[PDB]
Design a protein around this ligand. Structure first.
Ligand SMILES: Cc1ncc(COP(=O)(O)O)c(CN[C@@H](CC(=O)O)C(=O)O)c1O
Ligand SMILES: Cc1ncc(COP(=O)(O)O)c(CN[C@@H](CC(=O)O)C(=O)O)c1O
Lengths: 396, 396
């Protein structure tokens, strides 16, 4: 049965990582992966988390299965975060949330759901996007088209190009949006743009799918959600996939959610049932540990305060590295302006580098960027900035 | 898009559990879900687990992603449990293991893998079997056929009928086998039958897929792997989906493994890469918590000794309930002769009840069995026995 199986192509992200290890060179930097890093170059366990964990150690009396959708408080807490405390969506019992194994698991779950219960055939993602988007949708047997997004020339959002590709999209098509902190560009729309896209969407019959993997990393928890919120204000239906991997430092625990929104309660309920059937035939029910830690923290005022502060620290550290990066770029001879960087959000920055430049950076230099050409500002440290900056100049 | 979605039917297992949850009548017995219960009628957290979770709490320094296949130690440990310390499959490096979200997760990954990289079109499952089997397979696009297994008349394994039905199975078809403790029948094959089953499988070209969800609940860790080991001794290829939900009481942490076995290390490696690609488009990487717990316990002689003892206690409590159940039934007045019970293994027992009897047994007195007429022996206590049997006799 397996003699003729072909090797699978290496994973664009994961693949690069494997090689980072094998590169046995001393002073090699590693800016190519969307995980948070501290001033010391480590990815620690949050203090709020370690606390929520003592608590769970002390208080759990059973490990009996959660329900297919997971921890209820988990669900309410997420919807609050997404939509806001006094949301009508919430008030009208118009949304349902399923706890899933990470942001990926949600996407997948949303994928299977749509493929088997709807007339959906195509999902539109941006160019560029997180490479894994395509594989997940394609796995559900859905088509993935692409929309223009980035302006290679001006290092900004190509609004017209974007609105222009979107016209090849049919009513009933799924359009995927990065909630904030676009991967891998770091370029997000403005509130005004989001509002324009929102009106367009309803005018056109698109089904919005938001990918929210870094809420709290652009401007702050609430700000970062104004986009989603503008859509939710006019859409009857919508889907949201979120992840708590970056914001809670819970990567390996697989904490995310899939929120389904319908015109009304009777509808989401009917629909949510199919979504649950989908989960049942996939992984059955979710992993408790990380979601539990999340609920505990979001529910306890003290823990939650420590957490938001930890989040703020992470976010500020990033903002520090962008400025420091363009600065050192300048003081290092670079004679290209890297100031657009400063206007970018999140961990990712589309530096401007070329496919070859990237190869070079890593071959000669030991500096590992993303295949796509983006760098993870979060892997930069006051210590590694110089060396890293010399190398980039050396290839411009 | 959601307007006409049709509500999903209730799950045969999960659906009853909920039904049982919305009735607070007194002496309400719950025998229809396959979770272990103690004499107190609870599902406790093992002490070995509690011990391991502290260690983790004390040692963990990061929640950074695990690789697609999870924890290495976890894989080796699983393999040794499965095949034996000195297995050739192990020495020849002929097997690769992916850490998955529970046994359902493993099954689903095996399914996607098979569907996308192979000529498999059908999977043969026993009649009856755990109802979720048909669902995971169908979700992956595979078709499922059923082979006879159970002798309603004699409360045994219909070996002839089984073999006789399997004959309709072609070369390249997947035949699903429950490693031990058949669900929901409790009827397992003898070693001699396994051997017969192994040899016929080789010559007919079936691809064996073993579902191993309760290793340790029949006779013991090793003893339980006997059947798996006979096949392994003469197949070039095979797939193993295992669960640590029951045996470690880690139900909600989602701890399982998918083991792939090929003719050699090069083949296994190439197939495995296709497996990892399947995972990556599903949930991406697995939940660390449960698995670390397993790995830690399995690696430590001390924790290990403690863990095996707790398993032994669980197993012996079930054996106790089997005997007490036939005795009480006996006394309480039953007409039928339920000694066959004694010969069954694990948590379940096909009592031999009809569809109506189960309906009645639950509308009438609040005894909740599985639609199939199976009854979870592990949800029986010395307290609830009498009332239980009283209800049962009332319906024969
Ligand atoms: C935009 C985006 N969406 C969804 C996800 C999936 O998140 P979960 O880890 O919660 O599943 C990621 C993670 N992308 C990271 C890491 C990775 O892809 O493995 C990145 O390096 O871009 C992401 O960047
Ligand atoms: C035969 C069998 N295989 C796989 C699984 C899945 O195990 P995981 O929980 O590790 O995914 C179960 C669990 N079956 C239980 C519980 C359930 O079906 O949800 C049962 O009631 O039979 C099972 O009985």
């Amino acid at each position: 049965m397996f003699e003729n199986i072909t090797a699978a192509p290496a994973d664009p992200i994961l693949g690069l990582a494997d090689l980072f290890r094998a590169d046995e060179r001393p002073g090699k930097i590693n800016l190519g992966i969307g995980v948070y890093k501290d001033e010391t170059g480590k990815t620690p366990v949050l203090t709020s988390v370690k606390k929520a964990e003592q608590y769970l150690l002390e208080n759990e009396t059973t490990k009996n299965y959660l329900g297919i959708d997971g921890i209820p408080e988990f669900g309410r807490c997420t919807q609050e975060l997404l939509f806001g405390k006094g949301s009508a969506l919430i008030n009208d019992k118009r949304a349902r949330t399923a706890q899933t194994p990470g942001g990926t698991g949600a996407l997948r779950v949303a994928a299977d759901f749509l493929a088997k219960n709807t007339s959906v055939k195509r999902v539109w993602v941006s160019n560029p996007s997180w490479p894994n988007h395509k594989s997940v949708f394609n796995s559900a047997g859905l088509e993935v088209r692409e929309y223009a997004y980035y302006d290679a020339e001006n290092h900004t959002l190509d609004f017209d190009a974007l609105i222009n590709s979107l016209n090849e999209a049919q009513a009933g098509d799924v359009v995927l949006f990065h909630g904030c902190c676009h991967n891998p560009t770091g370029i997000d729309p403005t509130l005004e743009q989001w509002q324009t896209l929102a009106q367009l969407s309803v005018e056109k019959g698109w089904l919005p799918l938001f990918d929210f993997a870094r809420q709290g990393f652009a401007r702050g928890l609430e700000e970062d959600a104004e986009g989603l919120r503008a859509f939710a204000a006019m859409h009857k239906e919508l889907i949201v996939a979120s992840s708590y991997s970056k914001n809670f430092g819970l990567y390996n625990e697989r904490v995310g959610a899939c929120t389904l929104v319908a015109a009304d309660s009777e509808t989401v309920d009917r629909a949510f049932s199919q979504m649950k059937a989908a989960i049942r035939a996939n992984y059955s029910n979710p992993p408790a540990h990380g979601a539990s830690v999340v609920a505990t923290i979001l529910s306890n005022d003290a823990l939650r305060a420590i957490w938001e502060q930890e989040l703020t620290d992470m976010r500020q550290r990033i903002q520090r590295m962008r400025q420091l990066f363009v600065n050192t770029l300048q003081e290092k001879g670079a004679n290209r302006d890297f100031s657009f960087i400063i206007k970018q959000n999140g961990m990712f920055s589309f530096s401007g580098l070329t496919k070859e430049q990237v190869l070079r950076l890593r071959e000669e230099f030991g500096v590992y960027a993303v295949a796509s050409g983006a760098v993870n500002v979060a892997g930069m440290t006051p210590d590694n900035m110089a060396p890293l900056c010399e190398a980039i100049v050396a290839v411009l």
